Write an enzyme that holds these catalytic residues in place. Structure first.
Site, short mmCIF file in Angstrom:
data_model
loop_
_atom_site.label_atom_id
_atom_site.label_comp_id
_atom_site.label_asym_id
_atom_site.label_seq_id
_atom_site.Cartn_x
_atom_site.Cartn_y
_atom_site.Cartn_z
CG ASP A 150 -4.67 107.66 68.69
OD1 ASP A 150 -5.59 108.45 68.97
OD2 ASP A 150 -3.50 107.79 69.14
CG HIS A 169 -10.33 110.23 68.28
ND1 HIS A 169 -9.65 111.25 68.91
CD2 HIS A 169 -9.44 109.23 68.11
CE1 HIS A 169 -8.40 110.88 69.10
NE2 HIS A 169 -8.24 109.66 68.63
#
Ligand SMILES: [Ca+2]
Ligand SMILES: [Ca+2]
Length: 122
Positions: free
Chosen positions: A89, A47
């Site tokens: 996300d 991420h």
């Protein structure tokens, strides 16, 4: 926007981003360095890489559009940044779910000081 990302995590894992994922392993939460401790920790590492690719987007505060299209988190249409931030996300939230089986409570509140090793590359 982190608060939307937070909502995805809860939706995907049933847990709250805080504190279950705000300070886990070497990469979950603020900062990050060394090598991911496990599957879960890797989700956070990737991420970070993801957000790293969005050099000119307010990755943390930009509010994007998304929705649970048939129990599936789907990113809505907006600006390149919103769409990109949302995807990072989106993928992370699901990666957490896929790694629930190897989730280690012993890694929650893991000292960043114990993360001493050649930090991995994106
Ligand atoms: Ca991080
Ligand atoms: Ca926005």
């Amino acid at each position: 926007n982190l608060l939307q990302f937070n909502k995805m995590i809860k939706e995907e894992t049933g847990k709250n981003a805080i504190p279950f994922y705000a300070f886990y392993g070497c990469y979950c939460g603020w900062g990050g360095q060394g090598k991911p401790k496990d599957g879960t920790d890797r989700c956070c590492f990737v991420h970070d890489c993801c957000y790293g690719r969005l050099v000119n987007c307010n990755t943390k505060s930009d509010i994007y559009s998304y929705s649970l299209k048939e129990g599936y988190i789907t990113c809505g249409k907006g600006t390149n940044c919103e769409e990109q931030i949302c995807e990072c996300d989106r993928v992370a939230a699901e990666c957490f779910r896929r790694n629930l089986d190897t989730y280690n409570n012993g890694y929650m509140f893991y000292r960043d000081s114990k993360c001493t090793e050649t930090s991995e590359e994106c």
